[PDB]
Design an enzyme around this catalytic site. Structure first.
Site, PDB file in Angstrom:
ATOM      1  N   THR I   1      24.138   2.935  73.343  1.00  0.00           N
ATOM      2  CA  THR I   1      25.185   2.545  72.635  1.00  0.00           C
ATOM      3  C   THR I   1      25.281   3.530  71.186  1.00  0.00           C
ATOM      4  OG1 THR I   1      24.154   0.593  71.354  1.00  0.00           O
ATOM      5  CG2 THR I   1      25.157   0.064  73.443  1.00  0.00           C
ATOM      6  N   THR I   2      26.668   3.718  70.637  1.00  0.00           N
ATOM      7  CA  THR I   2      26.786   4.394  69.618  1.00  0.00           C
ATOM      8  C   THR I   2      28.361   4.188  69.152  1.00  0.00           C
ATOM      9  OG1 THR I   2      25.103   5.837  69.932  1.00  0.00           O
ATOM     10  CG2 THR I   2      26.780   6.592  68.458  1.00  0.00           C
ATOM     11  N   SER I 141      22.037   3.084  69.118  1.00  0.00           N
ATOM     12  CA  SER I 141      20.808   3.799  69.296  1.00  0.00           C
ATOM     13  C   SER I 141      20.929   5.063  68.888  1.00  0.00           C
ATOM     14  CB  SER I 141      20.184   3.706  70.764  1.00  0.00           C
ATOM     15  OG  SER I 141      21.422   4.024  71.536  1.00  0.00           O
TER      16      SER I 141
END
Lengths: 222, 215, 215, 215, 215, 215, 222, 222, 222
Positions: I1-2, I141
């Protein structure tokens, strides 16, 4: 345990095996893991058989209770939310070994295009839900093999019969690569269960059609 | 003295029930037929309690709506606890009678409602439909043929007594019920059936074009 | 005045039982016979409490039905706690007396019921059947021969007293009971027996063809 | 006697409602229009309950403000529990009727309020707007065209019935509503609309320059 | 009769309000000015609720002191939960209205208090000061110009109405307020201001030499 | 009627207060002086609340003894929670007013008591002693010079008004207080002082040979 | 401990051994492990003897309590559900050491075909229940040997007596292969207990018939 | 982090750095750790940033709440007691990592001598408090270096400007010997924050003065 | 995820990827992690997907509930405080694996200068919040790579289009250096989602513009 679900033009089909084991020992050869919850929804739960039956019964009672109280069935989003809440509530017990993974198939009557009203919803261990847009999903110990078989066979789906055949073949592959999944039993005559949902509602596929499909697949691979 | 207060309370409940629309529930060949005079389209006096158990009421809407919700909650819990087929209309009628008696005795204002619980046989099974009538004070009676609720029930009762015929068809039963209730139009009528021929859920509403054509 | 309220409450209860059907429970050679006049087929005024203990009541249906359920709950719990043979009709009669006295004194409206608890001997044991009558105020009386409940009990009691005979057979006992209650057909009659000859559970209903032939 | 107390409570509530400003809720082509006689700029008698559900009230301010907050709390909880599209005006009207009846029967003073719950169709969907009127005693009614609350409602209702036009524009509907309410100025009027053409939230206030120009 | 009880309760509360000192709250160029007749130097009838919100009262001291404490507790909690700028005088007025209605309906003796909540704009903002008046029964009103509490308020209100001047200076507004309240010396006056020019906390008491100089 | 109950409850409290011994609390150069008519040596109407806070009362002994214990418990808790110097006589007077108002309104019998709280300055600090008088109904007033409680207070109040001299020594103040109280001997008097010259605890009793010599 | 149950045309039979041991020590030689819960149902419980007796007594009390209160007995599904509920509620104590596995045999009076009205229900550790369709089931420490013997011997079952003989032989095999199951004690004259359920109800098989069957089996295997 | 406080003739000064880290990674460059709790007391809290902000907000709310309710502000001892109670209530959470130590600076208006009315109070982990009588105190991860620098520099403190310069120099030393304290960043123009309390109240020092002092110190040490 | 967020003159933009994994297995390819909470706010939640959806839904419900009750929306500080309280209440679940990190972008309509009314707020695991003044922030992350790419690319942000392009490029770099972040799928046609907030409100960026930008970046790096 393996339960597959896949969309076809104009509806959805959902199939499941029949084997239930305790360790390496086979305890049940005719378990039913696909349940018709409402007129246009079918749920299948992998994991512990007791928890699967309990969740199926409780979810059906919940939906019927809401429909009787308010005089109108829930929208598909409401049903998804109730199932996700029930999954989230069992997380503590799932940590203790009473784990249950549900997979939900439905037909949205309020959708715009009736040909694309089929809906497949998958829930993860944390209770979150995702509406699968790839057209197929699977749960259970043999879910990976079934999904990888459907990835290759999904181009052949054109109607209800083709979708049912692809689902049966996916279950056969899952049983071929996994020991906890029971394949078509030609000796005892026990075959995977299936439910087809379309504009007319949800109906259980008779065992005769599934038997012919399984025999055809078996002769094809021989 | 308790006697005067109780008589006044009973008179209040009776006057509340009297100034209300009439409901008729009658047994016919296919099951049970509920016909009510309901001008509203959303507020409904006829509903399903359980697979083969239906509910009709006459009186103040909020009160019998609360009773309906309580009965549905009881029926669903009983079905989940033991089995779906272990729920009967007799148990629901008894629960309603006890609840209404307690409400009449202890509550500040008695419930001005009159209830009927109807039950039909299961699929592929023969049994005479059962109709139970519960009054405001909790008295429970078994009506084998028809139940009339609310308003001046004497004329409708006599009209039904003269016109009722056992094992009548749905159209004949609806004609008899409407004729007795007049003594109405497609609108301002609520019609429902507990149909013994349905596989699991017997309750079915007859509204719109189907009601217009059948009647 | 507090005494005025108590007398008015007693009169309310007395009128409540007065306008009700009558029940007769009498001892015969095979045990105890309960005979009631009950048109309804689903509402039952005679029931079992425990293996050798039976229950009859006369008055408001929901009230003595609640008492029935409470007595069954008490009996089953007591039997599980100690043993099945430790439950006797005397204990149930006493708990009913305490419950009815508390309800009469404290509750908003007293229970308009009269109860009869009957007990027979165990299998292979000789003992005269016991009958206990419990009134609306909690008074408990040990009746040796017969108990009459509900309605105008004076003529029924006099007819029984003139016609009663100990060790009468089941047919003669039923004939006497029906003759005393008439002062009836197969329908609108509820007949049950605590039969001391049964191994464990003595209560047995006699309805339909058997009642039609025997009577 | 308790009936005297009940009629006195009803009279008190009716007197409280009558000595108040009038509110008009009428259905027009674009949805529902609420017009209230509100001199104040901070206190509001018209509010949003949910995405397509609006609320109007007439009477004592703090009471219907409490009911407004309760209805908002119920609607948000129900929408979070199942989904936003599962909340309808019928459920809110039923909850309001139940709570108002309970308050009237049990509370020390009856609530001197009259409520109207209005619902419009969702985006890209056609449906006739629904209007529900709930009174102090809990009585709930369905009004197909318009609802008038508070004050002397007979002349306003007669004027509306004479001048009502289905599928009228917003300006024509506002002119009709103001004409019926007069029997006022740009100030001392509260105007709001449930606009069915809005994507999610239908409630919208029309105040200031827009109200001056449109009226 | 319940209506007789309500009228007697209202008469008691009104009599309690009348036999009390008078308080005037009036808006001037710099904000809001509170002037009260208070011989006591320790017991204060004017106090701060929040940074830009002030409180005034007339009646029995302990009652509106309790209301003051409750309002401060509510305001601090609301400001902590969301933000300081989320607290407004309208919320406090609504809370006071609901609380006073509950006290009037349910408590053994009604509160003989008359309350005013005043709000000014934040620093570097333009907004007309808001005044809300709450009565003993819980009624709420928005006063745009001035609020008069306690005693015979007709002559005081008439004098203020004739002598009122918008955007008046602090000295001129104080002179007008004292002149109207006369119909007093430096002592036996409690003077406070909500000053919109202050950075965070607007409330400020004017006592002693400064009050004597301005007066 | 609420008014009827309040006036027969107020006169009951007044009559209870009237038939009681009188207490005087007056300020003098060294602090505050309490002089009461108390024949008993063990039951005391004058007591310490906190370091610079003293308490006097007139009425039914058990009631103001309970109030005394409650005030001491409040003061010690408040001093522990924040600091000893954060405790003032004003807060204790406010608590007493709240409690007495609640007791008068809600309890079956109002307390027939009349309280006075006195506060002096701290060590090495100059400040006029403060006296607060709290009545049976919760009313609280500030007295600058002297407080008279219990019995027929008019003669003592007039005598003190005529004879009070500010900054009088202990002997002069004691003589004036005794002379006004007479309008008796060393026995049947209780005398105490809040002495501003004490380092921490100001309260000090004057009895026996010391009171004989001083008087 | 070993309790077997098997269906025959027209009814069901349930048999149980008599030995109860703690560790390797024999503590009881005449324990009765098969109970007649209702007129048409019989329940056996394997595991700790105390928990077995407690559950049997409590289940019978519950069923009779419902029958007395509602005036009509529960359907077979209701009884199954109540037993499964008690099994689920005992999971916490079962992990503590008071394990109890029940096996339920019944005759459905509402069944369509009287020749196939016998029902066998088995419950797992998680409380889930399964209706055996192979015609036989067993519980206990020696359950596997009994089931594997009945698998070979079930072709001989044609009526009540043949089914009783097959059940006794299965118990004999379980006792022969497992030391916690007691065999026919000819010295003391203690033999397995049996209950036969048919249309006329549930009846205890007298000890003489079982003694004769056990003696015949023993002489056959000699 | 580091927060220093020191008394000067006629008042007190109190400064704090701006860096906040999560391990070795710098996550905040302009954190404000010194707050004005009320017109004569400032509070700075070292430790977890979230806990510091929460305690500062709650302490200010409690002080203003008491002042509004009672009509008179708390004495200095009362404020100290409330802060000590707040610190003691956090011990259970402090053992879980939500640690926070406050340092309180104040100007006692009720003190006899205005020239010595400045007060510095330091709290420990167990809620105990101590009024510093050596004229200076520091809290934080770099507090030891700041205290050891002030021990030498305190002889130069004679007024507000000298005290501010000494505080900035102490923070510079703490940042020099400790990597968790941020020094004056001449590139981004971020400098330590300061609060000066005297008879006229508590005021925030403008950034220009602190920037000038920091630049002078940096040029002196170059 | 970002999830990345950055300010541009006159507004703010927030973008997020589409991949969802459990371990090394890819399970979701079209997840939406950026939600439009209010007319002028947008929040993105990184971490467990279920907790992300739950927090987004609950936060939006709470803000709209307050607006409906009080007739006026919360100020930006109020919204920040409610989100911080929600984060703080999840500490127990976060220690048990159900972590959720929010990043909030908004437009302060009450701000004086409209050109600087964009606001970015970041939260830590302890519930503390910080209003970023560097103009960009990221969570997930791959947040480190995204932040380090925006640090070099932020000089090119001059309007909404440039900000959107920089956000897409930062997401591309994060997916390039981290295997848990999904890059632009040119095969399946799945691209990162974006929300742009300005004085006119918050709008979802159409997929066509993001697809064009992603294709341009891809051909530029080829």
């Amino acid at each position: 345990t393996t339960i597959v679900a896949l969309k076809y033009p104009g509806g959805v089909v959902m199939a499941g095996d029949r084997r239930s084991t305790q360790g390496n020992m086979i305890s049940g050869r005719d378990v039913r893991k696909v349940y018709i919850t409402d007129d246009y929804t079918a749920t299948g739960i992998a994991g512990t058989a007791a928890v699967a039956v309990e969740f199926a019964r409780l979810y059906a009672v919940e939906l019927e209770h809401y429909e009787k109280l308010e005089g109108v069935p829930l929208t598909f989003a409401g049903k998804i939310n109730r199932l996700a809440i029930m999954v989230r509530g069992n997380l503590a017990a799932a940590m203790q070994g009473l784990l249950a993974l549900p997979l939900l198939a439905g037909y949205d009557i309020h959708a715009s295009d009736p040909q694309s009203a089929g809906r497949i919803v998958s829930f993860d261990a944390a209770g979150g839900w995702n509406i699968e847009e790839e057209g197929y999903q699977a749960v259970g110990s043999g879910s990976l093999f079934a999904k990888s078989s459907m990835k290759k066979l999904y181009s052949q789906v054109t109607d209800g019969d083709s979708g049912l055949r692809v689902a049966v073949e996916a279950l056969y592959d899952a049983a071929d690569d996994d020991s906890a999944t029971g394949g078509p039993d030609l000796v005892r005559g026990i075959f995977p269960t299936a439910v087809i949902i379309d504009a007319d509602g949800a109906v259980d596929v008779p065992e005769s059609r599934i038997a012919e499909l399984a025999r055809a697949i078996i002769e094809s691979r021989s | 003295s308790p006697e005067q207060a109780m008589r006044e309370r009973s008179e209040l409940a009776r006057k509340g029930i009297a100034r209300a629309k009439s409901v008729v529930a009658l047994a016919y060949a296919g099951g049970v037929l509920f016909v009510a005079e309901n001008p509203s389209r959303s507020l409904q006096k006829i509903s399903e309690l359980y697979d083969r158990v239906g509910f009709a009421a006459a009186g103040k809407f909020n009160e019998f709506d609360n009773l309906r919700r309580g009965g549905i909650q009881f029926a669903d819990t009983r079905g989940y606890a033991y089995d779906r087929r272990d729920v009967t209309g007799r148990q629901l009628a008894n629960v309603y009678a006890q609840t209404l008696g307690t409400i009449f005795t202890e509550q500040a204002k008695p419930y001005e409602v009159e209830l009927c619980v109807a039950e039909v046989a299961h699929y592929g099974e023969t049994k005479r439909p059962e109709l139970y009538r519960i009054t405001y004070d909790g008295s429970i009676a078994d009506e084998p043929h028809f139940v009339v609720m609310g308003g001046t029930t004497e004329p409708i009762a006599n009209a039904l007594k003269e016109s009722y015929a056992e094992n009548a068809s749905l159209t004949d039963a609806l004609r008899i019920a409407v004729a007795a209730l007049r003594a109405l139009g497609v609108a301002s009528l609520e019609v429902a059936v507990l149909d013994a021929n349905r596989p699991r859920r017997a309750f079915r509403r007859i509204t719109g074009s189907a009601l217009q054509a059948l009647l």
